Amino acid sequence: DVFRRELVDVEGIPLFWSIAEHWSQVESFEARPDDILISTYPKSGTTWVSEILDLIYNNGDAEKCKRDAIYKRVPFMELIIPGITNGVEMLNNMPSPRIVKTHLPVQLLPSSFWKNDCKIIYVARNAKDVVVSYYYFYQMAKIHPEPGTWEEFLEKFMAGQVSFGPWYDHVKSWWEKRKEYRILYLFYEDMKENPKCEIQKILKFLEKDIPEEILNKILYHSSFSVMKENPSANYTTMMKEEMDHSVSPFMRKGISGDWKNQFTVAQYEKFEEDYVKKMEDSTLKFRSE
Ligand SMILES: Nc1ncnc2c1ncn2[C@@H]1O[C@H](COP(=O)(O)OS(=O)(=O)O)[C@@H](OP(=O)(O)O)[C@H]1O
Ligand SMILES: O=[N+]([O-])c1ccc(O)cc1
Ligand SMILES: O=[N+]([O-])c1ccc(O)cc1
Numbered sequence: 225d226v227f228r229r230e231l232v233d234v235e236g237i238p239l240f241w242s243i244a245e246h247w248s249q250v251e252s253f254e255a256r257p258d259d260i261l262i263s264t265y266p267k268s269g270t271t272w273v274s275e276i277l278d279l280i281y282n283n284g285d286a287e288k289c290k291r292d293a294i295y296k297r298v299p300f301m302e303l304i305i306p307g308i309t310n311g312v313e314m315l316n317n318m319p320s321p322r323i324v325k326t327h328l329p330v331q332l333l334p335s336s337f338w339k340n341d342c343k344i345i346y347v348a349r350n351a352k353d354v355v356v357s358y359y360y361f362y363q364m365a366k367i368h369p370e371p372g373t374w375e376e377f378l379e380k381f382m383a384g385q386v387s388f389g390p391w392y393d394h395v396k397s398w399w400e401k402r403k404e405y406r407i408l409y410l411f412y413e414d415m416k417e418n419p420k421c422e423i424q425k426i427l428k429f430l431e432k433d434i435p436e437e438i439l440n441k442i443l444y445h446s447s448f449s450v451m452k453e454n455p456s457a458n459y460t461t462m463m464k465e466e467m468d469h470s471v472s473p474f475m476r477k478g479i480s481g482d483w484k485n486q487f488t489v490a491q492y493e494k495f496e497e498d499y500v501k502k503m504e505d506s507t508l509k510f511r512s513e
Contacts, residue, residue: 226305227366227465234408237329237389239302240367246304249312253301257334258321260430261344262298265394266327266387267357268349269412271474274298275448275457276423277323280432284441290456295396297456298323301334308466327388330397330421345407348395349412350510351499352483352492355381355391359486360472362386366465368374378491382498392502399508413511416480419443448478 231238234247243250255261255380260277264270271294278297283287299314301324314320326333337344339498349357355378362371368387371377384390402409408429415422420443427434444450451457452475458469459474487495496497 226308228368228370230369231385231387235332236382237261237332238385238387240305241389242305243302246310246312249304250302251334253315253334253336253348255324255334255340256320256322257340257342258302259286259324259335259337259340259342259362261324261326261342262347263326263328263333263344263398263407264347265349265354265391267354267361269347269410269415270325271457271459272412272415272446272451273345273410273426274323274325275451276426276442279442279445280423280427280430280434281321281323283434284438284445287465289445290454291458292456293461294457295459295462298325299325300325302326302328302344310505328388329394330401332460338405341405343356344407344408345426345429346398346402346409347412347415348398348409348478348508348510349511351391352487352495352512353412353480356483356486357476358386361474364469364471364474365467374486378487382495392499396503396506396508398505411464411510414482419446448475451475480511483512 226242229241232241232244232354234244253289261276262270262273262277274294275289278289292385296314299311299318301311301315303309304309315324359371359377362368362377381391382385384393388394398407399409401407408425410425423439423442453460460469
């Protein structure tokens with residue numbers, strides 16, 4: 225059974241057993257100078273930005289972006305599961321320019337990305353909304369260990385005992401890295417508030433100037449209500465064994481502030497006290513609504 229196993233430590237970080245088992249293949253990954261790396265802590269807007277990027281690369285052409293599922297269009301690099309998927313091999317066989325997805329903490333990223341000085345788009349999302357999203361995701365996406373109860377999962381998340389390790393270190397270290405490499409550091413909440421502005425930031429970073437009409441086309445097709453019903457973007461092409469959408473849909477709510485529906489007031493106060501202690505060494509600032 226490839227599903228529901230315990231995580232395995234990889235250079236200090238809990239990862240899926242099969243990623244750990246094939247780690248040398250990940251660490252030796254060969255990047256290319258024109259790769260665009262989308263880097264996120266899980267549940268922070270990876271699919272959203274991956275769809276935006278593929279739409280940009282295809283000039284807002286919806287049909288072209290339906291050539292395959294997002295997880296084939298924008299391969300999840302480190303995700304290797306025997307009999308199921310191999311992100312490294314998918315990318316190895318993909319023509320440039322490649323869009324590459326990762327959730328790896330900075331210290332675990334294959335060094336080829338640094339050596340090739342690749343452009344990277346990092347997306348961060350407020351921790352409270354992340355942990356709620358990740359809880360439901362753990363339930364539906366069977367490669368993860370059992371999340372337990374909300375209360376149990378919340379504690380594991382705060383302790384960094386979840387797949388890809390602690391959110392706090394992930395966002396903080398990636399933030400620091402922006403001083404060394406070309407990292408456009410985006411926030412899920414900004415994309416919610418003003419998607420046009422954020423996509424304009426992406427275009428400037430990519431050194432692309434496109435017509436307003438194409439920009440509006442990209443905006444329309446990357447909206448939650450369009451993506452949620454789009455089989456090429458909403459993960460419903462996954463086998464039920466890998467992802468069971470009847471448990472929780474991948475495109476779940478797509479808002480900011482769902483944490484209010486999940487956290488008890490006590491859980492919130494405790495989470496905030498812990499958060500301030502973990503995040504005061506950082507100039508990083510988030511909005512929770
Ligand atoms: N277009 C658009 N607009 C707004 N929100 C969106 C969009 N697409 C995905 N989502 C929401 O993003 C959450 C999934 O994040 P990820 O794509 O990073 O998940 S994953 O790490 O790639 O598995 C998950 O958030 P929750 O709804 O809070 O669970 C998705 O619903
Ligand atoms: O099989 N799976 O569970 C997968 C496969 C590919 C992917 O990008 C994410 C999950
Ligand atoms: O376990 N999974 O199937 C996953 C996990 C993380 C992710 O971003 C996509 C799929």
